[model samples]
Target chain A: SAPDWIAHPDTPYLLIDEAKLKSNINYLKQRVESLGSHLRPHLKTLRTLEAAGYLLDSKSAPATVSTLAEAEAYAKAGYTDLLYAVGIAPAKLKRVAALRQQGINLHILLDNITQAQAVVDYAAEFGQDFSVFIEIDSDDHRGGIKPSDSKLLTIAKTLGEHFTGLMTHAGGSYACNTEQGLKNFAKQECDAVRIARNNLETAGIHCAITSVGSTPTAHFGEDFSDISEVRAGVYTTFDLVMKNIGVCDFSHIAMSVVTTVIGHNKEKNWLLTDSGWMALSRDSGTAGQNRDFGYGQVCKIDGSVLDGLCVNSTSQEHGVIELSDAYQLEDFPVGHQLRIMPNHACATAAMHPVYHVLMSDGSHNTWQRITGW
Target chain B: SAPDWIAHPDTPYLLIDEAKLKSNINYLKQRVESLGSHLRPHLKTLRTLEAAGYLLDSKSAPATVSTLAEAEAYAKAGYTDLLYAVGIAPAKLKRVAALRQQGINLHILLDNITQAQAVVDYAAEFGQDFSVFIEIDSDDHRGGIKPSDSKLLTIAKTLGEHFTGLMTHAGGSYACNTEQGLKNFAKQECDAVRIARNNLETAGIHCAITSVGSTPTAHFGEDFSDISEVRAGVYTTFDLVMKNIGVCDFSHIAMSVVTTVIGHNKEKNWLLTDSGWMALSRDSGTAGQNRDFGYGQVCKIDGSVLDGLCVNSTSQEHGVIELSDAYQLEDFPVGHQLRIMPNHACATAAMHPVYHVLMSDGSHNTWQRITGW
Candidate 1:
């Protein structure tokens, strides 16, 4: 049985199973403990102070943020030793300095010498000492300089006292569908950051941290000997994307969108839901995966997966569900409660302002989440 | 030339050109005026009360809201006569009644007899009268019942005095990419709603409003002769999807995401940006269109289109830029400001908590937007 609000007529809301959420968090905590590396979970996935509090229960636990707004939110909540993970934008250095001035050990990242020089110059101008991390691109997928790139040394040298460490995100781990693929990418991720650390140290720059991770790599990486801290997000509330990546199972996914069937196209075997892309998110991350869950996988009100039914398409406020087999109109009568497992937890969670946590005891609590930069 | 903040060190923000926004709004106002139908601009796209204020400044101006939050925001801001366009969810009726009790004329929608009965029962239980429109499916798109379905009459009969009118969204109009295709769908949309209105009127149901619209059909609809009111959103901040559908031109697009180059993969000829799918959204609405604008089209800081570049791919906080032709590395140096035109306005706008309004005089103001259900 669920709460009255869970079955409320109008929905398309974010539902987090409190028990499953803690299970995911505890698993990560245990993983980090065994690896002898700190888990600086990225706040981009669950951008809530309350959610972050679960991971960083004490002031000793370091955290990572994707935006200055997130950094401000976490810092304001008394969590110091924060890593503002995105490559530092020049104009944003002022805000970073402000955060640092407020006694928040906020670290910024950059992959190029230009950014390194700008950070140094901005620090000189503002008269603030800012910690910096030189980003490395292990997968050549997105940001960061290549581990072997010689500019890595130049960037480290330019930052001088401001340089803090080296970090890399194996974002391409999402492209993996097998456990071995994730393991290999994780090894590659660890090696890239270790090499970057060596390059910096050889050039007489003492890099304090060698960071490496992503949700898939952090959980499946074969080697973590050289890594000092792992920065991964999205595992706290796994999604279909993670499920398709073979990192987590559907039962482990803690996030889902609570929706209600609004209409049906009986002749066409279509069931329409009030939850559209606006609620489910437009991240078709799983589209490129082995199993394309369309927009999202369908589920019962209690978060049980409903096989053969997928959100085939979505409009702004309407989700058109398609069935692989025959079903009567009574199968999904109008106003019936349905839950949707999202493709990407980060994108889906960003759409919601609050997370309605369903406790193990059939109780519910509203958890506030911070959105936007 | 743009303002300092436009080229600031860190961006990845939603930018709305006030002049272009006004142009699009004026164009829609003129179109509705010529068609002799009232323009009840859906506030889903802009979502800001300031933007809605521009459309509903006149007391006679009616508006459409996709969510109760939008209705409450608009109603609290003094805009009256709103149509909460989504099909009525049973649990949400209480919130609707509360809004109505606040002296706000909030109209709900239902497309089936089950929902009609629920609304009627809920109204009776609350001892309050509710205004509702029976949703009709004209395009076999998403929500709504077919106009020809006998259930339409049953639904009308089920809701004796609570039924206000009939409505349909020609969402399939977005499927049309030609002028004639848009016209044909618009005609179909008009006929379906007109027939539904006639059915209700013939049954002595007192159907007061016959509403029909979509961004494309509202502009190219062949017959508004019988339609009492037209509802549309997204036209105010036209997007690449609208451009591809032949509804609006590129210059008419008023929304864009401002980002900065953070890194580059020289070997792969890729430029990485801070505006990942998180900022620009993962809505590949233009993927099936005439031209696929990858994630979004690349542009200069001043909104000038870059012919050879597109956001080829995106991660959570990184956008990989692909150049169609050979270009020097200096073309997009690190920290260089760039603008990205999104595929869908509503999806992209929902990502940002605030809109950086670029006024006509090169000034900027922050406009708050409502997000989540």
Candidate 2:
């Protein structure tokens, strides 16, 4: 059910199920509490103050952001204890210092001596003790210094007291399609963060916070061990990628793109939708997984999975939902509403300006989303 | 050259080359003018009033929008003549009628008799004549009825004066990787529209506007004898997809994502960037093309193409730029600025909240972009 203003059959809109979101957030909070750690929810997936209200117990609750724009937005909304998680570039250091100067504990991440030295120099130039975290690579998927790499120690020593802690993201956990694989990657994530902290402590550096987590690792990890806080974003709004990774089920997914059947190619048995890549996002995160949910897994307006239907292809403003089995022309008439669960929640959510909050009581409200860095 | 506020090494930014944008727009305008037709530029690519200021000669210049949000934004900015190019869903007709009632000649599109009946009924209910175009399937790539399909006439006969014209988009022209292929598709597109228009005329229906175009067909089409107006987008902001389609060169592309080298995996020879799919977009439109820019084609700060380099993979906020052949780690130093030309301008532009316009005088300004329908 949708509010009058946001009622569907209006093709292509980001829908956030409030009840499911709360359930997911509560699940993460409980999981992190059981591990004796803090859940510093990443706001990059649902970059809205309304969504933050669910995760943050108070204004001072710890949160993570991917960009300065997000940090600023969160800060403006009275959110504090923010960690700007992306590797800090020299150009961004000035903005970081500015946010810090404005009386916020804005933390940053760096991996190499180059960024470390730049951070040190910027701190001296701005006359601010900018808190820094050493980003360690747990999975060798993307950015970060390898835990065993000597440069981690060298970079730590260079930052001195400015170094706040060690943080790592097992981004490679996304590649794990099995339950065991997710658990192993999660264990690996914890070990990598622990190893980095131990190395820093061995060198007489005070590693206050040892942080780790990706959506999959945060939920499936068998042990947190020495990890102080888990930074997970997409888990708050599960997606097809997480579903394929064997962490969450379709019922756990809180985000979906509401679309209308604009036309039907009866000859090809394909239904065209207005929820193209611009709306659903071109994140085929599950394309390499055991089951590839092309653009997204198709669903009915009420959030029930549409069996054997997926958006097989997408242009800028058009989506082609290929029918695996049989489909009559009347089956998906033009103007019929449908829902599509995205491949990657973060990427898909970023495409929308606002989320239509669908409450359990069938009432809805618009939640503004902040985008751009 | 960039403004100090928006300088180099700023991760995840959408950069618009003012010079290239003007050149691209001028090219399209000249091309359409040569055919004695109006270039009703689609606002889906650069969804900004400032960018539209370059395309539209006046406040009331004929424009095209994919979303009602874009239409509303453009309308608020004083753009009156607009064509809502996507096949109109029945649910959206209310909003369409409202926009028209408010003094904007907001036209819509549809392909079938069912939608025609819905539009006619809605127009009667609202007491507003909703102008619409018959979406003709020039190429069987996506939506629309075939030119020879009898339903096309039935749909036309169903709506008398409410029917504006017949519009066809040879979206299939994008599949053309060769010049001859582009030229052939263009002719086909013209013929399809001409046939639809001729059919309606013979049936005694006044089809005023015979609109047809895709960026590729609009630029490379050999003939436009019967086509009254060209509705083209993406040409105003060329991209890697158009480059692969052989319509525009890499030099003609005006949109790019400005990113910073955050870290690297020396073993894999991968330079990681802060500009992931969220910034550069997940639209790997060129992935199917011969070039196959994995995520996007890598470039230096000054927009110089970095040969043998492309963003091979991406996470939420991290891009892995894989070097085809490399030497040292210093080649892409930490905090170093780089620009990535996107596969599709429309998809990439949709990701960012604002466009950082790089003017000819080495100055820059942030132009706000409208998103969500």
Report the lDDT tens digits of candidate 1 across residue range A1-373.
Answer: 5576687435888899888988998998788768777788887898998878778868647889888888888888888888988887777888888988899999999888788888888877778998888888898777788877888888788889988888888888888898888888898889888887777778788988888889999899755666788877899899998998888899899999988888877788888888888888888888887899998999988677888788999888879888666656687898788899989899988888888888878787888887777
**Residue-pair clashes, model 2:** 0
Query: Could you give the DockQ of candidate 1?
Result: 0.69
Instruction: Kindly give the stretch of ten consecutive residues in candidate 2 chain B with the minimal lDDT sum.
Output: B1-10
Model 1 misplaced regions, further than 4 Å: A2-5, A8-10, A324-326, B3-5, B8-10, B201-205
In candidate 1, list every pair of residues with a backbone clash.
Answer: A9-B91, A91-B9
DockQ (C-alpha based) per candidate is 0.69, 0.73
Tens digits of per-residue lDDT, candidate 2, B1-373, equal 4455445436678888888888889888987788777788888888888877998888788888988989999888888999999888888888887888889999999987779999889878767797889898889887888888888889988887798888888888888899888888889999988887777788778888988898998988766766788878898878898898888888898888988888877788888888788887788888888889888999878788888888888877888887766556687798777889998888888888777888867776789888777
lDDT of 1 by residue, B27-76 (tens): 88788778777788888998998888667657447789999889888888
Clashes of each: 2, 0
Write down the lDDT that model 1 would get.
Answer: 0.84
